[PDB]
Amino acid sequence: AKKEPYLKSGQVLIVQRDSVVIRSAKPYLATPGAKVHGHYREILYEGDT
């Protein structure tokens, strides 16, 4: 909304009457032909490709 602060990146984890809890997430842009290293929901540690 115009009268509201901008949102942060992440997934909506909790929905309540007048507030929302967000789990922090970072998006990465990838072009066609790129390769993703890992299945869905695969745990990635810091520094992993």
Place this chain on the structure above:
Amino acid sequence: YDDPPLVCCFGAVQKEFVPVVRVHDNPMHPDIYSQWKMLQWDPPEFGRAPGGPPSNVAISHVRLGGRAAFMGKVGGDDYGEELVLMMNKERVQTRGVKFDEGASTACTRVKIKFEDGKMKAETVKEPPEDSLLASELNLAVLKEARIFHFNSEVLTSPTMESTLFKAIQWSKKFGGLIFFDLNLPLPLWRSRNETRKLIKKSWDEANIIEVSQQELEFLLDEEYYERRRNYTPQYFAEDFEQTKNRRDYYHYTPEEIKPLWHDDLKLLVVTDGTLRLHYYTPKFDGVVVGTEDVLITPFTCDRTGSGDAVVAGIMRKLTTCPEMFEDQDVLERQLRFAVAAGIISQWTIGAVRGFPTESATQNLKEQVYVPSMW
């Protein structure tokens, strides 16, 4: 009366002598002092920007472009002359310094007792530094000086405390402002209630007060703020910033400060080293964001005397910019000058040796801050 306006520093002139002493939980090797510099770049919180004797503030104030006079007593021996020659070299006025030819400078006669199976000492004869009399005050200095500065070390001496309040009466009669730089010595950290009673009379006489974050929390409630810093939400943070687990820079509300506020107080400054300068006025309050970098010079860094440079920088701008008391934007810009002075003071071994000049301080301020904050 020449410009810039004169400032008077009252108390004991000493070489180094950090007064604020508490218990740290991270000691280095007891003999290998080459390891002790690691505590200069990871200091105890009470020692992030240590203060010192009032002569440090006077010397630092002059190097920053001001004019200062020291009021106190030294002995007639050789060490007394060295202290006076130190202040004359730094162009600090010494007409207010009185000589006691029958006393030894910085020497206290004490007697050792063995009460209840423990060793204690009691003072037999105070040193000349703590024995200035009211009849020895230089009234020409107190008439000219616009800021009267003193520490709480004078409250540990019965003679100086009586002399202190006569000096304050004269200074107020001549329109001078009273600057109370707390710098609690070791005895005054024993208990909150005894210390508050000891400092209450001098606290009420002050127009400007500088305290550290540790001193302020000790005077109000030490355990409440320690619990406040250690609180962590159980499930999720209340806001995105609380997730970053950053250092705590809590800004005390004016209602928390209210037990320490009085009618004549114009400016209260709470220093978190050089990192934060919380300021409080009757009309407004806020915080100046600062910084520190002692790791840029790991082998010459020494935080001793940096608290005196910050205080000297405040007095340098207060005398020349009287609108700091009423304008918040002006006050914040001038306090950034004091932040820069504290930063430079931490880059040299020795307090007096490392006190910065005005042009060096102004240069660092413009280098650190973006031009809109100058």
Place this chain on the structure above:
Amino acid sequence: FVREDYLVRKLSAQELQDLVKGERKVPLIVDFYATWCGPCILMAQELEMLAVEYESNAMIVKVDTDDEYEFARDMQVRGLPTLFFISPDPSKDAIRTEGLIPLQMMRDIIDNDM
């Protein structure tokens, strides 16, 4: 086979009390210091030199305020560095000094007042 690098001994409050209560013939110099205090680095080097000059004509000891904080406060320590000069004559009162005093000043106290 290897000479020790440091002459000044660190003593507990209990050990210092017995040393003061016991019989002494040489002047006793007690140093209060803390490893976090910047000026104590300079004072530590001066007292090691003082120990070399006064081989057996004086006894130089040091006490850490991080370990004996309550003891230091009872001894009227108002800050660091602080030195106590205790005479072997029990009637004479001790001399407490504050700040980084010169090495020559220490010698004058030991020779003329101790």
Place this chain on the structure above:
Amino acid sequence: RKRNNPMNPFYHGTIRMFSLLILSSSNCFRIGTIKNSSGPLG
């Protein structure tokens, strides 16, 4: 077995499993007749 053995009483984070991750405040944050009443009916 216990009898073959050869201290004397007389003297945050939420687990996410599917592989384990811990969820806490470091990665989750908040963005801010008679009258009928809710309750049992029997």
